[PDB]
Amino acid sequence: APRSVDWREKGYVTPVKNQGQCGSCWAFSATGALEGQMFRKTGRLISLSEQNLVDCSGPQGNEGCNGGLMDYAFQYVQDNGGLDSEESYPYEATEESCKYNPKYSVANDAGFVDIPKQEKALMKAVATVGPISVAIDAGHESFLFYKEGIYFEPDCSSEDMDHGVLVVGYGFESTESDNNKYWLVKNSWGEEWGMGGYVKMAKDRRNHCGIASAASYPTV
Ligand SMILES: *[C@@H](O)[C@H](CCCC)NC(=O)[C@H](CC(C)C)NC(=O)OCc1ccccc1
């Protein structure tokens, strides 16, 4: 596979969003992966509605601001036959009743693909598919204050993930410890967090923070 990948340079990635004070990271991760796959198909990048997922995908197993899973979001889009655009169904950071309107649907999927729980398989998916939805252990102060460089947290769990984000690429840079590889990860905490809202997470360091443990993408 390539040494470096960045799907932002290919037009697959919308700007960084802000989930606010709602536990809806899973919906931002899901819309990010579907934005990328929709773009691959149609050549048009259209920001999608996280609020649509938060309000409406309970029957697939999601729980709104109390948490969810990207795969359930992808299942909702398939079962529901659509997903509204961000502009038509904007984000309010609180769970409300469902207001989906098929007239404003701009995305569809036909299911999803779960990636084997190995960073080698995640790397192949990122290299060939597009941005990939992943779950990480983000429950550490070091993650809140991240600004620059490759993020590595010795106390990160590879098993107990609590935060959905979006791998948009991977790369390398020289470091003091010669652990030089990273995943390029889009977060949903606004652009003031991290590096314009992105983090470089340690790659090929024993599945650091569980990034390869629950990776998937929608089939469009
Ligand atoms: C990130 O904004 C949220 C915060 C959840 C607590 C308020 N994290 C998640 O939703 C997290 C993401 C996965 C690890 C991909 N999942 C989660 O909290 O799941 C709990 C849950 C499981 C199944 C069904 C409903 C809720």
Q: Residues marked as binding for Zn(2+)?
A: 9, 50, 71, 86, 92, 96, 114, 137, 140, 160, 162
Please state, as a whole number, how many other Cβ atoms lie within 10 Å of the Cβ of residue 108.
17
Rounded Cα distance between 86 and 84, Å, is: 7
Q: How far is C-alpha 24 from the geometric centre of its chain's CA atoms?
A: 11
The answer to whether residues 193 and 8 touch, using CB atoms and an 8 Å cutoff, is no
The SS3 assignment for 134 reads: strand
Pocket test for ligand 1, best of 60, 69, 143 (most atoms within 8 A of CB): 69
Q: How far is CA 119 from CA 34, 201, 205, 211, 215, in A?
A: 21, 12, 9, 8, 10
Resolution (A): 1.7
The tokens describing 209, both together, are 């923070």
Whether the CA torsion 185, 159, 155, 205 is positive or negative: it is: negative
Question: β-pairing, 198-202 with 112-114?
Answer: unpaired
Class of domain 5-219: alpha beta
The structure's method of determination equals X-ray
Please state, as a whole number, how many other Cβ atoms lie within 10 Å of the Cβ of residue 95.
17
N residues, the chain: 220
Three-state SS across 46-91? CCECHHHHHHHCHHHCCCHHHCCCHHHHHHHHHHHCCEEECCCCCC
Domain boundaries, the chain: 5-219
Instruction: Using CB atoms within 10 Å of the CB of residue 147, give its burial: 0 to 12 exposed, 13 to 18 middle, 19+ buried.
Output: exposed
The answer to whether residues 101 and 84 touch, using CB atoms and an 8 Å cutoff, is yes
Pocket test for ligand 1, best of 57, 63, 167 (most atoms within 8 A of CB): 63
Catalytic residue among 62, 187, 207, 209: 187
The SS3 assignment for 145 reads: coil
